[PDB]
DNA sequence: CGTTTTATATCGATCGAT
DNA sequence: ATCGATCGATATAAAACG
């Protein structure tokens, strides 16, 4: 009864890991609390960005490998445009759940 | 006749003889899709030669896309290749073709309904479900999708020959109905 | 660089420590050590420099296979994916992504790439 | 039964788009 | 509400198989 983890991979998640990290290696908390700190940000990352994000933003390129396992898609997109709101981009990888359940 | 049809795409079988994890296969091979729920079986493209392969837990699988008889049994040692190096005793077994799909363009139209009502026990013609003619030739046993363009499509076979010795029987009947 | 992933890490760290509260309390940690969660955390944050915050100041082959923060990563959830031939379609949203050190936030996004 | 390939073509759609 | 548009059938052969 949980959220996708994906969102520990990325920026904001990773950080996190590691300040949680220097606390568990400090003795400041128990690797369970550090573990349910990561639980909480999965949802709470899955409602931030379903609520209080509005850009829409398209990428264009040639894919060079795909994936489909376990209900996530993994793309590797090369010499790609991918416009906000333009960059040029060498190689962008993603990777993405399912919006259903 | 002329015209000679054009292969368009080569369905193949390949035994690899030994059993296979497809969670396993789709965790190690690149632009391998598994979706048990929906097909039990890893669907695998390559591009050298453009094809899709099905493979199966039983180590049978399935080529499709190939364009020549060659390209079929090239592309299927590939996949077979792959399976390999990811890590099972696969081999490239029984390979057999099983369907070639071809078409043609003769470049005049065709009154299809006349065509149809001519060669009433091969033909069965309803624009209302399907736009082409379905002609289901005997000899050879080939079924062909005649369109009101002059577009053909002749599928069924299992040499390439069947697919020329098919068209070569209906072009004078599709000649005799062209519109003009 | 980007004010919308600004306003959503903002929103989710402070987030999180709102929502975990009630567990650090459970576990016997006082709130000076959840506070000292979010200060690393922001320190981290700022250290990526992804994008600027308003805390900034206060801190002056065949086979499958390159995770950093010079990785380009997008990670998210999809609505349809769909291909004719070698041409594919991605209709994404809810997504985060990070492109050459830096990041955006995404409602939607759509990708259009060439499998050739 | 579902999935894949592929040529071919027509009839509703939803479809951003007037 | 209406476009050119792309979208899901519709039809064909055939194998694999849970």
Redesign the interface.
Same mark, same amino acid.
């Given at each position: 009864p949980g959220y996708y983890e994906l969102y520990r991979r990325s920026t904001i998640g990773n950080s996190l890991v590691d300040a949680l990290d220097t606390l568990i290696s400090d003795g400041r908390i128990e690797a369970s609390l550090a573990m349910r700190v990561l639980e909480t940000f999965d949802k709470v990352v899955a409602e931030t960005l379903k609520d209080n994000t509005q850009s829409k933003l398209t990428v264009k390129g040639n894919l060079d490998?795909?994936?489909?396992?376990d209900?996530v898609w993994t793309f590797i997109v090369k010499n790609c445009q991918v416009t906000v709101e333009v960059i040029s981009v060498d190689k962008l990888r993603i990777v993405a759940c399912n919006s259903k359940k | 006749s002329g015209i000679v049809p054009t292969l368009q795409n080569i369905v193949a079988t390949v035994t690899l003889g030994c059993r296979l994890d497809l969670?396993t296969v =789709?965790?190690? =091979?690149?632009? =391998?899709?598994?979706?048990p729920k929906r097909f039990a079986a890893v669907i695998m !493209? @390559? !591009?050298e030669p #453009?094809t899709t392969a099905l493979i199966f837990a039983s180590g049978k699988m399935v080529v499709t896309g190939a364009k020549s008889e060659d390209d079929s049994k090239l592309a299927s040692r590939?996949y077979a290749r792959?399976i390999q #190096? @990811?890590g099972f005793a696969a081999k490239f077994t029984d390979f057999k073709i099983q369907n070639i799909v071809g078409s043609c363009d003769v470049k005049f139209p065709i009154r299809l309904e006349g065509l149809a009502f001519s060669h009433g026990t091969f033909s069965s013609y309803e624009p209302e479900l399907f736009p082409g003619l379905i002609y289901r030739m005997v000899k050879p046993k080939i079924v062909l999708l005649i369109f009101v363009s002059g577009k053909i499509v002749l599928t069924g076979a299992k040499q390439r020959e069947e697919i020329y010795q098919a068209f070569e029987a209906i072009y004078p009947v599709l000649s005799e109905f062209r519109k003009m | 660089s980007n004010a919308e992933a600004s306003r959503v890490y903002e929103i989710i760290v402070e987030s999180v420590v709102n929502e975990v509260r009630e567990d650090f309390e459970n576990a016997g940690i006082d709130e000076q050590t959840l506070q000292d969660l979010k200060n690393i955390w922001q320190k981290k944050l700022t250290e990526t420099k992804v994008t600027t915050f308003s805390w900034d100041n206060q801190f002056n082959?065949?086979?499958?296979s390159e995770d950093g923060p010079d990785e380009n990563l997008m990670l998210c959830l999809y609505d349809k994916v769909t291909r004719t031939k070698?041409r594919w379609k991605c209709s994404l949203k809810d997504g985060v992504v990070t492109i050459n050190r830096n990041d955006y936030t995404f409602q939607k996004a759509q990708v259009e790439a060439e499998?050739?």
């Open positions: 490998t795909y994936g489909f396992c209900d | 969670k =789709a965790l190690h =091979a690149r632009n =391998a899709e598994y979706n !493209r @390559i !591009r #453009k590939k792959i #190096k @990811i | 082959d065949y086979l499958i070698a499998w050739v």
